[PDB]
Design a protein around this ligand. Structure first.
Ligand SMILES: CCCCCCCCCCCCCCCC(=O)O
Length: 288
């Protein structure tokens, strides 16, 4: 038995980890209203994506990995000698990437594919990749890994804010918000993931209080966990995520793992400007 672990590009793992563990990536892409197509990777500067999105008369659209892209990656790993492939996918509630990796795994010959629906995104999704790799090193078998990740998913989540719901509304990736649309006010929505989908949680008066609300909601949850990893995932307003990251390092005990990451182009296209998430995993994920 020889187990590989791969993922899609929305796991947003650092290039250091991708290089170290030779993590294969099925890339998602963004298409701008001028017809320019960009596949996600770590070489394109995220600041230039936000600049182009801001200069777009029409919101850019995104594409999941084609089923052929999953198949090609599966065949490449199989031909390297891997007998089993664990695949960590973007939430099935917001993208068809998972079901396409699942169906691609049915179609590829000569290798066993174990597709996993992370029901989240960004480095929180990436944490499932890092847990699977760690377990492969420890000699666990594919079903044992899938079982462990499924348990991990029960104590994993995220809350988030965005400047403007228009991007999420345009793509249909905000669930059950046909009420705070258009109207709202200077008030700020706080959203959360729930069974793979993005739903409203609370409406607060200011953005400053929304960021305080992110921390309170998450700390209230993880105080009951035996292990805790927290991820501040920042959008285009650098000072928002850096301030929350710094504050969490101060307010939390060192027994909490507190890490930082950012949104890539595909997720940023759906969030728009001002995205800021606070995610948690009830595990001590190996980040090295
Ligand atoms: C702290 C963690 C926060 C995570 C927030 C992630 C927000 C995701 C918003 C929707 C993204 C949808 C991508 C769809 C890609 C496609 O299939 O075209």
């Amino acid at each position: 038995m020889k187990i590989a672990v791969m993922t899609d590009s929305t796991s947003y793992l650092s290039q250091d980890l991708i290089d170290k563990y030779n993590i294969q990536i099925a890339p998602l892409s963004v298409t701008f209203d001028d017809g320019k197509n960009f596949t996600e990777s770590n070489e394109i500067a995220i600041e230039e994506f936000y600049n182009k999105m801001a200069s777009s008369q029409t919101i850019p659209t995104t594409s999941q990995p084609a089923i052929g892209e999953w198949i090609t990656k599966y065949e490449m790993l199989r031909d390297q000698g891997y007998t089993d492939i664990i695949v960590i996918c973007l939430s099935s509630g917001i993208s068809g990437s998972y079901q396409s990796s699942y169906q691609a795994g049915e179609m590829v010959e000569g290798v066993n594919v174990h597709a996993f629906d992370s029901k989240l995104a960004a480095m929180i999704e990436g944490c499932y990749v890092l847990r699977a790799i760690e377990m492969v090193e420890e000699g666990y078998e594919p079903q044992q890994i899938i079982d462990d990740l499924t348990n991990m998913r029960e104590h994993t989540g995220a809350y988030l804010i965005v400047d403007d719901l228009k991007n999420l509304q345009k793509s249909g990736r905000i669930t059950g918000a046909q009420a705070w649309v258009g109207t709202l006010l200077k008030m700020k929505p706080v959203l959360k993931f729930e069974d793979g989908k993005i739903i409203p949680e609370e409406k607060v008066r200011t953005k400053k209080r929304a960021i305080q609300t992110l921390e309170k909601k998450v700390l209230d949850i993880v105080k009951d966990f035996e292990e805790v990893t927290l991820f501040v995932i920042n959008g285009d307003h650098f000072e928002d995520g850096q301030a929350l990251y710094k504050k969490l390092q101060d307010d939390c005990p060192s027994a909490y793992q507190v890490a930082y990451s950012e949104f890539g182009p595909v997720v940023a296209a759906h969030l728009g400007s001002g995205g800021l998430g606070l995610g948690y995993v009830g595990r001590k994920i190996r980040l090295t």
